[PDB]
Design a protein around this ligand. Sequence first.
Ligand SMILES: *C(=O)N1C[C@H](NOS(=O)(=O)O)CC[C@H]1C(N)=O
Length: 250
Amino acid sequence: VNIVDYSDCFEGISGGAIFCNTKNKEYNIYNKELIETRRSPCSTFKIVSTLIGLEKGVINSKESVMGYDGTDYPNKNWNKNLSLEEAFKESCVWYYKKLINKVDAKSVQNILDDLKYGNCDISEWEGDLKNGKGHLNGFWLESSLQISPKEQVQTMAKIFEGDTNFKKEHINILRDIMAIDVNDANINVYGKTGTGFDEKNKRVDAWFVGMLEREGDTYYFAIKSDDSNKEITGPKVKEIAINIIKKYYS
Ligand SMILES: *C(=O)N1C[C@H](NOS(=O)(=O)O)CC[C@H]1C(N)=O
């Protein structure tokens, strides 16, 4: 366990980072207090909800559809019968809400327990209804479910090292749709952003969680901001993450 200083890459934004290589068990941690603090995963939960949907047969491939019903949305790309691959990359909330609402709560509880997914608290299934957004809500979006950056990395490692019961075929679908283009062919980067605002503490929950492959070595990582500036989003934290990878993990 090395405590490290990635602060230059955060360019003044409050946050932390953790990178873990399970072959030689080197944990690199920036801002240990934050890295151990549980927070809502927001859209990073789509990593796990994709696997849940595949395991239960709600979806079957990166092509699979959820039966778009014509509802109007402001994001152009949500207004179509999009595939799993597209819904993941667009972070399409209606697709993943429809997916998860086809699965019984006990099945979800037992999967989260098996993954040690933070507090595994799905008690507020419908999510943070006080924000007014109705069905565009769920337990994983600033609601009952909370996970620390360290636990995210531990979960990613268990999934992608083959240490869960999820089918290898399903793991590989998730790998395919998480792949990121970082304009450097010598590293393979995979991940998912997440964006929320913690109304109680007036801080963002801005995430980028995933994995890095670089010549035999694999690092599992989680980068997280808790800044008070509402302009700090998951996509912004992904840029920070990419800068860290390029500076320190190349
Ligand atoms: C997930 O966090 N959400 C869905 C969507 N994706 O955000 S991302 O660009 O950080 O991946 C928008 C924000 C958020 C939500 N409000 O539901």
